[PDB]
Design an enzyme around this catalytic site. Structure first.
Site, mmCIF file in Angstrom:
data_model
loop_
_atom_site.group_PDB
_atom_site.id
_atom_site.type_symbol
_atom_site.label_atom_id
_atom_site.label_comp_id
_atom_site.label_asym_id
_atom_site.label_seq_id
_atom_site.Cartn_x
_atom_site.Cartn_y
_atom_site.Cartn_z
ATOM 1 N N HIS A 91 3.120 4.853 11.118
ATOM 2 C CA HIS A 91 3.409 4.511 10.062
ATOM 3 C C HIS A 91 4.024 5.513 9.027
ATOM 4 O O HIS A 91 4.456 5.301 8.074
ATOM 5 C CB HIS A 91 2.402 3.968 9.030
ATOM 6 C CG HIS A 91 1.866 2.428 9.692
ATOM 7 N ND1 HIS A 91 2.467 1.251 9.464
ATOM 8 C CD2 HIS A 91 0.906 2.095 10.652
ATOM 9 C CE1 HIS A 91 1.943 0.387 10.176
ATOM 10 N NE2 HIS A 91 0.893 0.958 10.823
ATOM 11 N N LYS A 134 8.891 8.463 -3.298
ATOM 12 C CA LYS A 134 9.303 6.999 -3.566
ATOM 13 C C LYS A 134 10.441 7.254 -5.053
ATOM 14 O O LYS A 134 10.983 6.260 -5.064
ATOM 15 C CB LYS A 134 8.178 6.189 -3.684
ATOM 16 C CG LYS A 134 7.630 5.874 -2.522
ATOM 17 C CD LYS A 134 6.452 4.971 -2.827
ATOM 18 C CE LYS A 134 5.808 4.451 -1.504
ATOM 19 N NZ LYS A 134 6.152 3.657 -0.656
ATOM 20 N N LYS A 153 10.552 -8.064 0.186
ATOM 21 C CA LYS A 153 10.039 -9.262 -0.582
ATOM 22 C C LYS A 153 11.105 -9.625 -1.827
ATOM 23 O O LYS A 153 11.426 -10.873 -2.100
ATOM 24 C CB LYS A 153 8.967 -8.789 -1.211
ATOM 25 C CG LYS A 153 7.562 -8.650 -0.269
ATOM 26 C CD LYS A 153 6.370 -7.944 -0.955
ATOM 27 C CE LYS A 153 5.567 -7.294 0.145
ATOM 28 N NZ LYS A 153 4.439 -6.478 -0.372
ATOM 29 N N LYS A 182 5.652 0.011 -6.664
ATOM 30 C CA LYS A 182 5.002 0.499 -5.400
ATOM 31 C C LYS A 182 4.189 1.555 -5.767
ATOM 32 O O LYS A 182 4.104 2.127 -6.964
ATOM 33 C CB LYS A 182 6.110 1.002 -4.528
ATOM 34 C CG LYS A 182 7.169 2.029 -5.268
ATOM 35 C CD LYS A 182 8.608 2.439 -4.629
ATOM 36 C CE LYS A 182 9.303 1.135 -4.538
ATOM 37 N NZ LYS A 182 9.705 0.933 -3.253
ATOM 38 N N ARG A 183 3.435 2.092 -4.978
ATOM 39 C CA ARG A 183 2.622 3.408 -5.131
ATOM 40 C C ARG A 183 3.409 4.540 -5.795
ATOM 41 O O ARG A 183 4.474 4.859 -5.304
ATOM 42 C CB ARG A 183 1.738 3.917 -4.094
ATOM 43 C CG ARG A 183 0.619 2.721 -3.412
ATOM 44 C CD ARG A 183 -0.585 2.477 -4.487
ATOM 45 N NE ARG A 183 -1.148 3.642 -4.792
ATOM 46 C CZ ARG A 183 -2.237 4.148 -4.148
ATOM 47 N NH1 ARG A 183 -2.927 3.119 -3.379
ATOM 48 N NH2 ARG A 183 -3.023 5.351 -4.402
ATOM 49 N N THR A 192 8.432 -2.512 2.512
ATOM 50 C CA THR A 192 8.139 -4.042 2.639
ATOM 51 C C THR A 192 8.415 -4.702 1.574
ATOM 52 O O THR A 192 8.821 -5.777 1.253
ATOM 53 C CB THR A 192 6.777 -4.371 3.389
ATOM 54 O OG1 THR A 192 5.799 -3.941 2.585
ATOM 55 C CG2 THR A 192 6.732 -4.023 4.848
HETATM 56 C C1 LIG Z 1 4.166 -4.775 -0.325
HETATM 57 C C2 LIG Z 1 3.414 -4.105 -1.212
HETATM 58 C C3 LIG Z 1 3.325 -2.822 -1.222
HETATM 59 C C4 LIG Z 1 4.454 -2.010 -0.276
HETATM 60 O O1 LIG Z 1 5.508 -1.792 -1.125
HETATM 61 P P1 LIG Z 1 6.779 -0.463 -0.957
HETATM 62 O O2 LIG Z 1 7.842 -0.538 -1.885
HETATM 63 O O3 LIG Z 1 7.134 -1.387 0.584
HETATM 64 O O4 LIG Z 1 6.266 0.660 -0.657
HETATM 65 C C5 LIG Z 1 2.546 -2.042 -2.039
HETATM 66 N N1 LIG Z 1 1.674 -2.587 -2.892
HETATM 67 C C6 LIG Z 1 1.609 -3.992 -3.040
HETATM 68 C C7 LIG Z 1 0.536 -4.656 -3.880
HETATM 69 C C8 LIG Z 1 2.450 -4.907 -2.342
HETATM 70 O O5 LIG Z 1 2.465 -6.100 -2.327
HETATM 71 C C1 LIG Z 2 0.757 6.011 5.979
HETATM 72 C C2 LIG Z 2 1.440 4.857 5.218
HETATM 73 O O1 LIG Z 2 0.935 3.946 4.249
HETATM 74 N N1 LIG Z 2 2.762 4.246 5.748
HETATM 75 C C3 LIG Z 2 3.594 3.208 5.323
HETATM 76 O O2 LIG Z 2 3.654 2.042 6.141
HETATM 77 C C4 LIG Z 2 4.256 1.000 5.720
HETATM 78 C C5 LIG Z 2 4.017 -0.222 6.920
HETATM 79 O O3 LIG Z 2 4.623 0.092 8.349
HETATM 80 C C6 LIG Z 2 5.778 1.346 5.629
HETATM 81 O O4 LIG Z 2 6.649 0.180 5.113
HETATM 82 C C7 LIG Z 2 5.907 2.538 4.572
HETATM 83 O O5 LIG Z 2 7.411 3.055 4.482
HETATM 84 C C8 LIG Z 2 4.988 3.887 5.107
HETATM 85 O O6 LIG Z 2 4.935 4.585 3.921
#
Ligand SMILES: *Cc1c(COP(=O)(O)O)cnc(C)c1O
Ligand SMILES: CC(=O)N[C@@H]1O[C@H](CO)[C@@H](O)[C@H](O)[C@H]1O
Ligand SMILES: O=C(N[C@@H](Cc1ccccc1)C(=O)N1CC(C(=O)O)C1)c1cc2cc(Cl)ccc2[nH]1
Ligand SMILES: O=C(N[C@@H](Cc1ccccc1)C(=O)N1CC(C(=O)O)C1)c1cc2cc(Cl)ccc2[nH]1
Ligand SMILES: O=C(N[C@@H](Cc1ccccc1)C(=O)N1CC(C(=O)O)C1)c1cc2cc(Cl)ccc2[nH]1
Ligand SMILES: *Cc1c(COP(=O)(O)O)cnc(C)c1O
Ligand SMILES: CC(=O)N[C@@H]1O[C@H](CO)[C@@H](O)[C@H](O)[C@H]1O
Ligand SMILES: Cn1c(=O)c2c(ncn2C)n(C)c1=O
Ligand SMILES: Cn1c(=O)c2c(ncn2C)n(C)c1=O
Ligand SMILES: Cn1c(=O)c2c(ncn2C)n(C)c1=O
Ligand SMILES: Cn1c(=O)c2c(ncn2C)n(C)c1=O
Ligand SMILES: Cn1c(=O)c2c(ncn2C)n(C)c1=O
Lengths: 791, 77, 791, 69
Positions: free
Chosen positions: A338, A535, A641, A529-530, A637
């Site tokens: 990942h 990011k 969304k 996102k985190r 992901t």
């Molecule tokens: C989908 C989702 C994430 C992953 O988001 P990225 O922008 O793809 O890092 C993180 N936190 C929550 C609560 C989500 O629903």
């Molecule tokens: C270690 C970890 O949290 N990896 C995370 O995995 C998700 C699901 O595959 C990816 O969408 C994302 O880019 C990546 O940062």
């Protein structure tokens, strides 16, 4: 099923289950009464489904993960069961507000971000596809912490999600198992024995996983730690064994080698493998057919110990010969990578492993010996190849490279987006893929369209169904039929109306939670996102200040108004992420209170971003920020969304963004910045942050404002750590994508000024989002890795 | 009438006899669930410990205390 | 202090002070015995506090006002001294009812409404903050008249509050001073002399002002007029000098240029300034340090003469040069503007002033000359600017614009709510603020949480303290901690229970005073404030009739029952206000006796609204009516009292209502109607009342009923004056806010039908009322105007 | 106290609505705690508070063995 019977059950549970009547019942009581009313509808099918797997005995899939970011369950259950409309009606007739009841439910936040949420979407998809799948993880007493903002900074509070009870879990006491730690190894004439170990019990809790409209109800089994069996102190010390499943490690994409984390990993693994073997021995199907009846997916390297543990069981316990055991093991496991970020790689020092799991260290050394013996036999002169392919890094204090252990012990290894899977195969694990070309694959991530469309955006789901039927729910590729409406003016207004309603409803949320007044006319620019340096919400923040200065310099200029939203949690010990959060709240303070900008621009730091809040903010977004440095986001992901919900994307050619561009047409996304190869060029040449600061007048003003205290008057040097990182240690080249980013941003506002053109692009994004359904992702895993079939 | 007490996670220890002597084992009576208790979350209360006393002109105040919550569970009689 | 000693003192005073025993003592005797028992507890601290100000000599604040709407003193004193519980116990043990004893006390009604009550709240706050502050006013023999209702009309009766004695005042004979009137000016070679004047003596009476729980006891000094030194006729004529402090002018927000009112204004001013200068000369601290030791706040323009009087003393008497004297004067005075309504502006004709105060007219002309000389020097060509900024209006019969005199003679000028202070600065006194930007400020009004929470609503004060401690009493912002209980069901029921008890207790009051039977289940809809066309209780009355017709048209329809309460005094000569009162009592008669409406709706005109009655009705209110025409209520304070006590607000975006919305969140208040800018638009376009009458069927029926005698059968044309004003002279656009008002009202009933939602909004109002503590208001005056510090 | 305040039955009737039996001295702190609530929080005077307290509590002694005191 119907309204009358649902009301009757509700009253029955409020009475016998909650011991209340209508004048003393609390809101929480009503939520619980409804939950039990819905839960009752799962039982029959839960029992039949599991009975069916025992009878017809199809091959089972076990998704082993330390995280399952489930969110809330009530609405998701009503929808997948086709009960939402009836329950809404019943609750309304009882004089209650179903929306209020739903907000009472705590999120099951047993995940950090993408990795944990992917596991949750996969469970929904596997149940909807009718696969005999099981999710296996840990039942943390406390999930990802609740985030509060105090004086502009992140503050953490315990996420005590089980305090009031979880009606969605079912203790399975008869399947409790003992897990072993420490002790020592004895190599007797009856087989090696692991002895004098400390024992911790594992109590499994099952949570039903309803497939979308299909009678399938699968299981998510989460283990909880319990102690076995001065007197008082001894009783209190039982807390120590129970601390193992106490808290979720709050780190996203970052390795922290704490012993307790190692205990959690072995705990899930040991309890899970034993339970699997036990179910296998009862299947009335010696272990030769095991890999034909079992597939175990390793979600990242966190459950890597599963490999030596399976070997330990086959060898030490079942007395199978090593070669036979090793063969069965590889055919059983598949590994999913990942991430490629160094700080996220799991490398456990051998000393810690030797102390906690002596026998597993021996088994790992053995695996490594046979492994290298092979390479030596193939490339006798390449001595460094051995060093590079070893499961052990002697590079200082010896440590175990868990990714390497997952690769040699698995028959398939996959990345989560084409650009990522390629990097994993040809760069990071070149030595391994070279030897076993066919071992490496790609499985682009996906999201479930139930929770992320039907549930979170009923208006859009209905509008779409209006035009193309409901087949799209189970075959998202059906959204391409939406292309027939490209010139359909009326439809484009209807689409915009749905986005407007979502924005209105979310704006209400924002005004009550935050002091701010929302211009509902503005473009909702969102980055959730985190919080990470990779990011780059820092870059987003640079652009925000940039727009601020522009309004100050020329207030009367025509400007598309925006509501900029940035949210996400910072890992507790991630200092830079915490500084970045404080920088954003500071900036927002100035912006939201400058009478000159007024309703032209509003900035909001969205607190406590989690699954249930994502379901609210995503449907209300116009512009989706996916700006990670090219090559850093393995897949993403959230990007998917937003695409599914009618937002346009501004981002780099990274992770799945690249595939969103392939599907929708690159021109229908606002791509910008350096690409993977340009980033490498700059690295080779050497990144000199100062050069952009010097050459870009708008950048320089922003930076100076930050560094001189424009945003922190009471403390001028507050953001010094960021300035220094930005100029001398920015591994993610924030300054290097600044110019293109801002130019790109200007283009967005241009398009926004043209509603018809904007919604035309939105329609092309939605109509092309079908590839990103997790149902498609799962079909690919089933066909090319687990070798199981949809039903 | 109302009975008021503490809901101990562990009651009086279970006694075993080993080689003629008493051995104590934790009485984990709630492990499998107690159907006879009913949590009453809406009546949770804060209890104070430690801290210090301040004798102000608005009355003596007990401050800087550590707080522990009390969650009541009702059992029918 | 303790119970035994309090009983002992009580008996001692009943004996030696009232000359009574238990079998002959009257209720009034018991009240006086308790009062003296409490009063004794003030002495030590009163003496120490005043001694302390002399010793450490901090800068003193003098609040100069023609009004101090104090209400009763007994309970307020027991509470601020921490004696209430002990006294309650002692009185109970003596077999007496302390509540009965408290009702014996007459209100010290030396004020008309908001302006006078603000002065009272300020005294409580300044003492609680430990400021060296003094209140200076007139000891009227008769305060605001007692209102009676006869045959539906207001009847006035003399408020002889001192008839039985005031134990709360202390004559200070040794500080008596002579005040001069009439006479003539002589410009001699020893300085100008004011001679052949008539002399009236000023006898000061001190009333202690206890701070809340802090050992500080400040002083309120009120002056009484006395004559100096055919025989019988000459003795009787002493009444003429004494008539000066005889009666409070009963006008709220309305100027009446009677000579006697002018005499009262000079009287307070002259006695006050002399007393201040005398105390200054004894401070053992020439007049250079005066502004560093003295701050005088002008409460509206009523005490405007203080400016030329201070100049007169410095120049004519202390022989200081004009420039020096003028400098010291400006640094001494600050002015507070309390209204923008034209009919309330003080404009004294120069002839009257010339006759009564010849020397002050000369000093004012001089001030004006230097003033205009400056403007001429800055804007030589703007001739009309001079006309607009002059202290004299030659516009017909010359008059003095007192507000302009207060502005040039003060270093700070402030409004009483943001919307108001802005209008004052940028519109009404644009010419002045342009010249001295920094002179204009805002100081949003406040109310004291002792009298208006601890005293009037012990149930709420206790409930709140139960949850968050007692810190809130001195730091009302602490009420935000109440937000933690938003989802706390039990707390919400407890909150509602407190409101219910208050309603029950007030309903008992209503049934014994009025013939009416009160449905204790009904929503208490309340509008209490002085009767004004701008406050529009007429609009409220339109809505009442509207609800009446609705019940008549469809009796069986589901309807939230209401008890509509409207109360307030009309200025004796305010004809329209008197007609409006008669309209309300008439409407109430029909409504309360129509068998078809019954307990669905009850209407009550609350007689003799005053401070002590406000303390009873406010805690019993659910809906607070704050419906003045946008831009007419400078601030309002009743709005704040209701918010603090658990009522929701229905009102316009006017005065402090705007800030109540900012603090609590606009959606947590029932805002409605035209806003300041919409009112201007209608004015520009021209208001055509008939159009709304024509277009709104419910409005038309109401109006017709009124005009045809539906509510006045024995005299069909009774309300003709109202009809005519409403159609052709409604400066306050009653018809223009009618539709939105009624729609808004319907929304209120909707929310009321949902107890949990209603109390949830109430909780947000209470938790956000902290900004409205007068303690916060005073801190701002101390820091930005008087330059003094809390202790 | 909370259930007492909701009884829609200030604290004068408390001992007529409440009886608390102290089972041995283990819950002895109940006495100073009731005083603390009446005084520090409800602001009742000490004498009144002490009177209500005694009328509220009854104590049951369960042993004379020294080691159990
Ligand atoms: C989908 C989702 C994430 C992953 O988001 P990225 O922008 O793809 O890092 C993180 N936190 C929550 C609560 C989500 O629903
Ligand atoms: C270690 C970890 O949290 N990896 C995370 O995995 C998700 C699901 O595959 C990816 O969408 C994302 O880019 C990546 O940062
Ligand atoms: O616990 C009961 N109902 C349950 C109902 C429930 C079950 C699962 C999740 C939420 C609610 C209950 O209220 N809770 C379990 C939770 C916890 O463990 O904290 C809270 C219950 C009903 C009942 C009825 C009688 Cl007559 C006597 C005892 C009783 N207990
Ligand atoms: O927990 C459920 N029932 C409860 C029933 C119960 C309640 C109280 C005492 C004993 C049993 C349960 O099995 N337990 C609570 C105990 C514990 O706290 O460990 C064990 C449950 C029923 C159900 C039905 C569906 Cl479809 C999904 C999840 C479910 N959980
Ligand atoms: O008026 C008080 N005492 C009285 C005492 C008195 C009574 C009768 C004759 C002479 C003196 C007082 O000083 N006077 C009544 C006279 C009059 O009518 O002018 C003058 C008094 C004591 C006190 C103590 C406190 Cl803390 C507050 C207010 C107070 N007033
Ligand atoms: C507070 C108060 C007022 C002022 O009320 P508004 O509604 O602000 O005009 C008037 N009269 C009395 C007796 C008051 O207590
Ligand atoms: C002349 C006069 O009485 N003005 C009144 O002053 C009070 C106190 O500032 C305001 O709350 C109110 O809106 C205003 O009408
Ligand atoms: C992503 N991440 C973290 O999550 C982190 C950290 N340091 C501590 N933590 C928790 N660093 C440097 C980091 O990059
Ligand atoms: C809460 N908090 C932080 O979390 C923080 C900080 N400085 C750095 N960090 C991470 N400061 C000053 C601070 O108040
Ligand atoms: C030998 N021995 C003792 O001497 C002893 C004991 N428990 C208490 N004592 C004193 N046990 C369990 C024991 O084995
Ligand atoms: C407010 N007010 C009065 O108070 C008043 C009056 N006429 C007489 N009085 C006393 N008018 C016209 C008025 O508007
Ligand atoms: C007492 N009263 C009034 O006060 C009044 C009136 N008409 C006008 N006014 C003001 N009538 C008829 C009347 O009886």
């Amino acid at each position: 099923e119907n309204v009358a019977e649902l009301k009757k059950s509700f009253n029955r549970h409020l009475h016998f289950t909650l011991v209340k009547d209508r004048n003393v019942a609390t809101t929480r009581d009503y939520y619980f009464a409804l939950a039990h009313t819905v839960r009752d509808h799962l039982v029959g099918r839960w029992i039949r489904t599991q009975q069916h797997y025992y009878d017809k005995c199809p091959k089972r899939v076990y998704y082993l993960s330390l995280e399952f970011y489930m969110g809330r369950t009530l609405q998701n259950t009503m929808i997948n069961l086709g009960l939402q409309n009836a329950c809404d009606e019943a609750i309304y007739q009882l004089g209650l507000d179903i929306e209020e009841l739903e907000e009472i439910e705590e999120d099951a936040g047993l995940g950090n971000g993408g990795l944990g949420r992917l596991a949750a979407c996969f469970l929904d998809s596997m149940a909807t596809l009718g696969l005999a799948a099981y999710g296996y993880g840990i039942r943390y007493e406390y999930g990802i912490f609740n985030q509060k903002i105090r004086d502009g900074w992140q503050v953490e509070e315990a996420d005590d999600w089980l305090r009031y009870g979880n009606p969605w879990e079912k203790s399975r006491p008869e399947f409790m198992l003992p897990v072993h730690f420490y002790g020592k190894v004895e190599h007797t004439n009856t087989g090696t024995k692991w002895i004098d170990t400390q024992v911790v019990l594992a109590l499994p809790y099952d949570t039903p996983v309803p497939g979308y409209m299909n009678n399938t109800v699968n299981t998510m089994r989460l283990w909880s730690a319990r102690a076995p069996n001065d007197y008082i102190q001894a009783v209190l010390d039982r807390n120590l064994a129970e601390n193992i499943s106490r808290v979720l490690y709050p780190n996203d994409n970052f390795f922290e080698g704490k012993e307790l984390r190692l205990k959690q990993e072995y705990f899930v693994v040991a309890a899970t493998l034993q339970d699997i073997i036990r179910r296998f021995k009862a299947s009335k199907f010696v272990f030769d057919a095991f890999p034909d009846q079992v597939a175990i997916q390793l979600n990242d390297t966190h459950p890597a110990l599963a490999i030596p543990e399976l070997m330990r069981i086959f060898v030490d316990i079942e007395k199978l010969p090593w070669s036979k055991a090793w063969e069965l093991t590889q055919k059983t496991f598949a590994y999913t990578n990942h991430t490629v970020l160094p700080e996220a790689l799991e490398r456990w020092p051998v000393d810690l492993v030797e102390k906690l799991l002596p026998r597993h260290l021996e088994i790992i050394y053995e695996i490594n010996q046979k492994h290298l013996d092979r390479i030596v036999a193939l490339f006798p002169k390449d001595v460094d190849r051995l060093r590079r392919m070893s499961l052990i890094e002697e590079e200082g204090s010896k440590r175990i490279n868990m990714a390497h252990l997952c690769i040699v012990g698995s028959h398939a290894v996959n990345g989560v987006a084409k650009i990522h899977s390629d990097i994993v195969k040809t760069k990071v694990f070149k030595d391994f893929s070279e030897l076993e070309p066919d071992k490496f694959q790609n499985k682009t991530n996906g999201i479930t369209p139930r929770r992320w469309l039907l549930l979170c955006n009923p208006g859009l789901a209905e509008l779409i169904a209006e035009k193309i039927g409901e087949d799209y729910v189970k075959d998202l590729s059906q959204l391409t039929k939406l292309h027939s409406f490209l010139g359909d003016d009326v439809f484009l207004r209807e689409l915009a109306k749905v986005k407007q309603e979502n924005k209105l409803k979310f704006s209400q949320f924002l005004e009550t939670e935050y002091k701010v007044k929302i211009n509902p006319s503005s473009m909702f620019d969102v980055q959730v996102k985190r919080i990470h340096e990779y990011k780059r919400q820092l870059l987003n923040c640079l652009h925000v200040i940039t727009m601020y200065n522009r309004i100050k310099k020329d207030p009367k200029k025509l400007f598309v108004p925006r509501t900029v939203i940035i949210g996400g949690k910072a890992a507790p010990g991630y200092h830079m992420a915490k500084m970045i959060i404080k920088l954003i709240t500071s900036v927002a303070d100035v912006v939201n209170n400058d009478p000159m900008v007024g309703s032209k621009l509003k900035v909001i730091f969205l607190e406590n971003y989690r699954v249930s809040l994502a379901e609210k903010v995503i449907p209300a977004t116009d512009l989706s920020e996916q700006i990670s440095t090219a090559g850093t986001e393995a897949s993403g992901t959230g990007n998917m969304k937003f695409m599914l919900n009618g937002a346009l994307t501004i981002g780099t050619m990274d992770g799945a963004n690249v595939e969103m561009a392939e599907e929708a047409g690159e021109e229908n996304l606002f791509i910008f910045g350096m690409r993977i190869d340009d980033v490498a060029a700059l690295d080779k040449k050497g990144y000199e942050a100062k050069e952009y600061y010097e050459a870009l007048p708008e950048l320089k003003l922003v930076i100076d404002q930050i560094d001189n205290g424009f945003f922190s008057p009471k403390q001028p040097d507050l953001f010094k750590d960021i300035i220094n990182m930005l100029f001398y240690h920015d591994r993610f080249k924030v300054f290097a994508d600044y110019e293109a980013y801002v130019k790109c941003q200007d283009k967005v506002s241009q398009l926004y000024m043209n509603p018809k053109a904007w919604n035309t692009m939105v329609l092309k994004n939605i109509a092309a989002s079908g590839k990103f359904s997790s149902d498609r992702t799962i079909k690919e895993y089933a066909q090319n890795i687990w070798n199981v079939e949809p039903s």
